[PDB]
Design a protein around this ligand. Structure first.
Ligand SMILES: Nc1nc2c(ncn2[C@@H]2O[C@H](COP(=O)(O)OP(=O)(O)NP(=O)(O)O)[C@@H](O)[C@H]2O)c(=O)[nH]1
Ligand SMILES: [Mg+2]
Lengths: 123, 1014, 208
């Protein structure tokens, strides 16, 4: 499972989108628990997210300090950001992710935790 | 690469290269597989590819290549056979028959290439469907004669006969004409006497498995249609029920044959046939008990282990026992020597009912419904099944599934959460279980209560405590509501509720307290009759619901509000009156503490609470007291409404505050919630806000258009504009809700209508398409439905404001603006129904668009649009006919009669609107009946003068169908229209002639005499 | 350990959308008719190792039928799809079944009633009985709401492996790499990003 050497810092239900720049539309990638996993050995925090029933990974990348969360034009409960190395589908690809939550409260709590985890990886 | 060379037909076909393209497709991957896919499809679709099938069957070393060759012949035989010369048809017949015999006599090919031989048999049957027996009358005699020369040929002849029986009796309704299916049915029925000889001989003497299995598989098809004497007047029932049940390699197919025999309605007066029907059931059950499993076996564990074909056998055994017993169990109920057989069979079903398999449980439950319903009415039968029914009570009580009302469910991680999607399959299964358990309760109330009272005792003392066990028991208790009498039910529910009230405040935990809360709420909501006669209980119940509205779990809060409505819908009388030992009507107590009670509820649950209070208040029929109760209830929303109206008449920006939008929308949502439950009684409250609400509607509308101008069309996606449009949608929803239930239509027309149309019509018309709310159309439909006959000028205005601009939104494709399409044609339907005069007031160009809109709805695959479009066309024709012989009616038929006839024929015959065939047939029949009843008093042409519309219609349709279907002979079209005309008052036969036409346009050479079937 | 799966049903019943949901997690709202067949590999992680389904997504519309029953050759399992909002698609289930089992005499087959998320349901649960005599497994499913969307493959995997206790398990989560953004295009990570930032997310009235 490759998760026993990690600690869960944050958990929240969410829906994850990837941007298909060719078709200029958002495409779903998964719905499930979004977790912030801090490795107990190296202390670097990653995002790990699995789809509900199949438990397949739809997000797997370090919360790099160079990432920034931006709002989406049609949502007050979503965040948009670029990702240069996600390995959910195999080889490290670059993606422009969007993640939506059940409420603006969950979306603000996520941004608080997302930035808290960024300060961890900055050492 | 160069795989495309096979698509060049000028040079010889490279058989080897073909075999590589095929191997690349089936065995390859990626691009080369997709490249080979498009090449093989093009190769197969070439009209001349069938001439290359001869050499593919000879020179190819790939079975899949020969398969595709046969598919190319299959398309030829099915669609273009009668166009070939007589020498090609014989030539193809011979080498199909020759290849089949060739593959059978090679014993190794017979084993290794089963797929290729089966494809060849099906292809041969396609030739039979074209040539037999009028051009091959010796087929069955030759087939029987060749069966003795080789055992492989004999086994394959059973596959051919099986396939032939399927194509003629099972799959001919939608693939042949009525006359052709009747022809091939009579042909097989004529020769079946000699087919059964071969079948029975092969079954009597029997080689080894393979040939028997193929023979029994073919018999399973014969049992659909063959006469009863072949089954009961021979020994074949003794063979199926004994010999072929012992060997497991024939047991499955034999069990399916016996199920088919069991489904026949045998002559219920023949003591001999009843004796044989009892006999094969007695033999079958003996073979199962001695060779498969004894009656005491744990079939639940056998099915879960899933060894071999155990699951399919238990499925087929369930199907056999239920089919037989649902039809013939009376044959066993009287004779005392047949009692053990009758009960061992039902005991097998009891054991089958313990298997964990939803679909298999539904099958056995369907039979239990059949049984217990019969025991409910038929005298002297209950006592036979007393022990069966007592076991069945245990099974159903322990396997109850979750009903609608229970909103709490255990999650994939073991947490008790709130269900997010409704399980329609689970809901239906609960209702089927309730229906059986209700019958079982009537059959023995004492046994049912003891099981439920004993299980509850072992839930109360933790001996059997379990979420599953407390849920199934509680759902079973609530489901039998109404089966006991009062006093008897009084005794029962006081007991149950108390222990539930106990267990609720005994178990601590976020999950446990929520599981018991839902069980309490479900049980109590199912017994309103008890709650009516016990106010002390009802009041205690209602206050516990309020206590659950303060819990953390949203599901417990939601169910409390739903249970509140459910109880109140039945017990509302006990809230309006001054109960004994009470200071005031309990509604007055609820209304006062309505802020404290709903302090922790989310908005949409607060609105459900207000709707529940609206149900109570509507029980009061004193107009003064009810209008005051209505005012008391709406205090908080009206107080907040006055504030956002006092400080909003000045400072228009307040509306733009996001928090204010959420507050405004929740106020209107509360007004919708109350108006839903009160209907016409909501008028005092509506008038208190109506004129201000419509100004708010105007204020919101301007802000929306300002945003789209300042930000662009993307503004309609923002949370701000989405919040403002919600105020418009909720305002329209409130007005629509009231007018749909209003009784004082005079007040609606004189007070409500004129300010409504002024506030919404030009706003909808002059907004950009993406800013238009389809809820405007939905609201106007209710206006035209309920008061359309009183506002003929309002209906005209409604048309002008929405008709042309909405039609332009939805006439470029079939998918843009989906909610506008549905509401658009709903509006045109009611206008054309209750106010047709408004279309007479349309300019002739706007009436041309109306006809275009109706036919545009024909070609929709959306059923919500397609059904309304065919209904409008049907009502329009009736509206035109009622006018009589006036210029508008005569102008209509001149300009539009043949547009409707041809546009209806187009969707009838394009193979893309099969879902609306019945309404299309009904419309075409009405149109044809107009001409042949001389209801059109003008010529439909601009043909020598004096000719009848009957004659021109036939010349027109014959010419229309000739150009659209050029492969039809003139006599096919002539006979079809002749029959279609004679039958334009007999819809069943009219639809049969149409379906016969749809078969004939798919092939070449259809017999025109087929249309004389009726 | 791979198995060929053919997927058949009337056009518009959701066959392609159902597969795309399993491949990428997306929900395709457009209807783009399949032409012949499209083969997609689909891997599931179980407690008995990975299992791979070579999913042959065939065409439902007759005019695009392609090789038609030729796609079924050497298939080892199958899914029959119909639409619970279209009675015609359920009346054709016996036809798709007939063509299928004439080529594949003894394979596991799931019958799926799709689009159960739509309120106006036309093929009610009470009339869906065709699978009983034919030994098919049946599931109400919705590619939109994901209701029972994993159960067809879970049932087929149990029947193909021969282990009724087979379960889907969480695929291992390899350690993700640490990578800094590219300052050569970080000045351009504001065009394709501001585009995505101003393209509205779909279905904003959902719970997620
Ligand atoms: N509401 C809803 N729509 C669905 C669902 N599944 C698929 N659809 C929709 O049905 C339409 C048909 O899409 P598609 O998957 O291509 O169906 P298909 O059976 O593969 N068509 P074809 O056989 O011609 O290739 C799409 O618009 C899709 O969004 C569903 O579960 N719910
Ligand atoms: Mg498709």
């Amino acid at each position: 499972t490759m998760e026993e050497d990690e600690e869960v810092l944050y958990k929240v239900r969410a829906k994850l989108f990837r941007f298909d720049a060719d078709a200029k539309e958002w495409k779903e990638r998964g719905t499930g628990d979004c977790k912030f996993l801090k490795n107990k050995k190296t202390n670097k925090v990653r995002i790990l997210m699995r789809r509900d029933k199949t438990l397949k990974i739809c997000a797997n990348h370090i919360i790099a300090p160079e990432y920034t969360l931006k709002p989406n034009v049609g949502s007050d409960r979503s965040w948009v950001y670029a990702c240069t190395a996600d390995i959910a589908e195999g080889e490290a690809e670059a993606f422009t992710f969007a993640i939506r939550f059940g409420s603006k409260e969950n979306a603000d709590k996520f941004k608080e935790e997302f930035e808290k985890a960024q300060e961890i990886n900055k050492k | 690469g160069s795989m495309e060379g096979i698509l060049d037909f000028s040079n010889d076909l490279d058989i080897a290269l073909l075999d590589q393209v095929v191997s690349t497709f089936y065995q390859g991957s990626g691009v080369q597989q997709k490249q080979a896919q498009e090449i093989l499809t093009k190769f197969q679709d070439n009209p001349d590819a069938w001439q290359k099938a001869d050499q593919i069957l000879q020179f190819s070393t790939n079975p899949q290549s020969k398969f595709i060759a046969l598919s190319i012949l299959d398309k030829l035989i099915t669609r273009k056979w009668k166009l070939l010369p007589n020498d090609h048809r014989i030539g193809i017949r011979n080498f199909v028959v020759g290849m089949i015999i060739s593959m059978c006599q090679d014993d190794e090919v017979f084993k290794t290439q089963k797929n290729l031989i089966n494809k060849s048999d099906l292809t041969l049957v396609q030739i039979l469907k074209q040539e037999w027996p009028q051009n091959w009358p010796e087929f069955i005699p030759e087939l029987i004669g060749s069966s003795s020369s080789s055992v492989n040929v004999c086994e394959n002849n059973m596959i051919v006969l099986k396939l032939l029986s399927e194509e003629v009796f099972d799959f001919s309704a939608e693939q042949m004409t009525q006359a052709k299916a009747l022809h091939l049915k009579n042909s097989m029925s004529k020769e079946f006497e000699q087919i059964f000889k071969l079948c029975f001989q092969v079954l009597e003497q029997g080689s080894s498995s393979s040939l028997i299995v193929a023979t029994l598989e073919s018999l399973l098809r014969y049992l659909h249609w063959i006469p009863y004497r072949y089954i009961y007047e021979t020994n074949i029932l003794e063979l199926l029920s004994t010999k072929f049940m012992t060997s497991p390699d024939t047991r499955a197919i034999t069990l399916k044959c016996l199920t088919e025999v069991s489904n026949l309605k045998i002559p219920q007066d023949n003591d001999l046939i009843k004796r044989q029907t009892v006999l094969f059931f007695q033999n079958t059950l003996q073979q199962i008990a001695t060779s498969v499993m004894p009656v005491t076996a744990d079939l639940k564990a056998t099915y879960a282990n899933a060894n071999g074909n155990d699951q399919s056998f238990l499925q087929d055994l369930a199907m056999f026992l239920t089919t037989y017993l649902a039809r013939n169990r009376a044959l066993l109920e009287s004779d005392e020597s047949l009692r053990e057989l009758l009960l061992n069979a039902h005991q097998y079903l009891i054991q089958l009912s313990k298997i964990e398999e939803r679909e298999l449980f539904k099958t056995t439950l369907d039979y239990w419904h059949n049984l217990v319903a019969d025991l409910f009415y038929e005298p002297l039968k209950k006592h036979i099944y007393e022990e069966i029914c007592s076991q069945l009570r245990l099974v159903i009580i322990e396997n109850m599934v979750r009903p609608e009302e229970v909103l709490v469910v255990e999650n994939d991680e073991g947490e008790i959460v709130r269900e997010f999607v409704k399980e329609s399959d689970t809901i239906q299964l609960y209702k089927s279980e309730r229906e059986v358990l209700v019958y079982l309760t009537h059959l023995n109330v004492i046994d049912t209560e003891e099981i439920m009272i004993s299980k509850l005792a072992r839930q109360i003392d933790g001996s059997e405590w379990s979420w599953h066990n407390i849920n199934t028991l509680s759902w079973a208790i609530g489901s039998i509501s109404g089966t006991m009498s009062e006093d008897t039910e009084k005794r029962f529910v006081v007991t149950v509720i108390k222990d539930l009230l106990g267990l609720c405040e005994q178990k601590r935990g976020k999950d446990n307290k929520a599981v018991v809360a839902s069980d309490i709420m479900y049980v109590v909501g199912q017994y309103p009759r008890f709650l009516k006669a016990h106010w002390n209980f009802l009041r205690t119940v209602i206050l516990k619901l309020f206590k659950f509205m303060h819990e953390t779990h949203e599901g417990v809060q939601d169910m409390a509000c739903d249970t509140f409505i459910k109880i109140v819908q039945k017990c509302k009388y006990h809230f309006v009156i001054q109960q004994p030992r009470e200071s005031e009507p309990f509604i007055q107590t609820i209304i006062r503490d309505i802020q404290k009670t709903t302090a922790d509820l989310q908005p949409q649950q607060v609105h459900t609470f207000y709707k529940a209070c609206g149900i109570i208040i509507s029980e009061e029929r004193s107009v003064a007291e009810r209008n005051r109760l209505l005012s008391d209830l709406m205090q908080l929303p009206n107080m907040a409404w006055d504030t956002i109206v006092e400080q909003s008449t000045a400072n228009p920006t307040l509306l733009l505050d996001s928090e204010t939008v959420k507050i405004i929308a929740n106020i209107i949502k509360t007004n919708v919630a109350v108006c839903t439950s009160m209907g016409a009684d909501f008028y005092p409250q509506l008038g208190h806000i109506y004129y201000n609400m419509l100004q708010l509607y105007r204020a919101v509308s301007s802000m929306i258009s300002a945003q789209v101008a300042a930000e662009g069309l993307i503004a309609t996606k923002t949370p701000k504009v989405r919040g403002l449009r919600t105020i418009k949608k909720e305002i329209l929803k409130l007005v629509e809700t009231y007018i749909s239930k209003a009784r004082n239509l005079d007040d609606v027309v004189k007070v409500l209508v004129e300010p409504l149309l002024n506030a919404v019509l030009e706003d909808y018309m002059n907004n950009v398409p993406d800013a238009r709310d389809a809820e405007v159309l939905n609201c106007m439909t209710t206006v035209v439905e309920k008061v359309g006959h009183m506002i003929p000028q309002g209906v005209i205005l409604i048309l002008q404001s929405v008709f042309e601009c909405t039609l332009d939104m939805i006439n470029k494709d079939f998918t843009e603006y989906p909610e506008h399409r549905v509401e658009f044609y709903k509006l045109l339907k009611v206008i054309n129904e209750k106010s047709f005069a408004a279309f007479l007031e349309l300019p002739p160009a706007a009436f041309k668009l109306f006809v275009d809109a109706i036919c545009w709805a024909f070609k929709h695959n959306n059923r919500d649009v397609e059904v309304n479009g065919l209904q409008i066309a049907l009502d329009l024709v009736k509206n035109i006919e009622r006018m009589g012989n006036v210029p508008f009616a005569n102008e209509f038929h001149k300009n539009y009669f043949f547009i409707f006839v041809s546009e209806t024929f187009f969707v009838l015959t394009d193979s893309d609107h099969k879902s609306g065939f019945s309404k299309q047939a009904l419309l075409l029949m009405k149109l044809i009946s107009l001409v042949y009843d001389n209801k059109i008093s003008v010529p439909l042409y601009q043909v020598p003068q004096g000719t009848s519309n009957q004659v021109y219609l036939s010349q027109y349709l014959a010419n229309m169908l000739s150009n659209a279907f050029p492969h039809l002979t003139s006599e096919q079209i002539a006979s079809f229209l002749s029959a279609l005309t004679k039958q334009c008052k007999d819809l069943v036969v009219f639809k049969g002639t149409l379906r016969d036409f749809l078969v004939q346009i798919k092939e070449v050479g259809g017999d025109p005499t087929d249309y004389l079937f009726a | 350990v791979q198995f060929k799966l053919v997927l058949v049903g009337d056009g518009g019943t959701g066959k392609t959308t159902f597969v795309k949901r399993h491949l990428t997690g997306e929900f395709e709202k457009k209807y783009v008719a399949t032409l012949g067949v499209e083969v997609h590999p689909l891997v599931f992680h179980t407690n008995r190792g990975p299992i791979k389904f070579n999913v042959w997504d065939t065409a439902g519309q007759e005019k695009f039928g392609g090789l038609r029953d030729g796609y079924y050759i050497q298939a080892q399992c199958a899914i029959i799809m119909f639409d619970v909002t279209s009675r015609v698609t359920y009346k054709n289930v016996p036809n798709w079944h007939r063509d299928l089992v004439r080529v594949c005499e003894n394979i596991p087959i799931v019958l799926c009633g799709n689009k159960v998320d739509i309120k106006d349901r036309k093929v009610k649960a009470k009339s869906i009985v065709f699978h009983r005599k034919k030994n098919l497994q049946y599931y109400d499913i919705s590619a939109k709401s994901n209701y029972n969307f994993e159960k067809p493959f879970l049932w087929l995997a149990r029947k193909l492996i021969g282990d009724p206790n087979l379960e889907f398990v969480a695929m291992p989560a390899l350690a993700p790499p640490e990578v800094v953004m590219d300052p050569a295009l970080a000045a351009q990570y504001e065009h394709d990003l501001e585009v995505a930032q101003t393209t509205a997310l779909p279905d904003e009235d959902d719970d997620l």
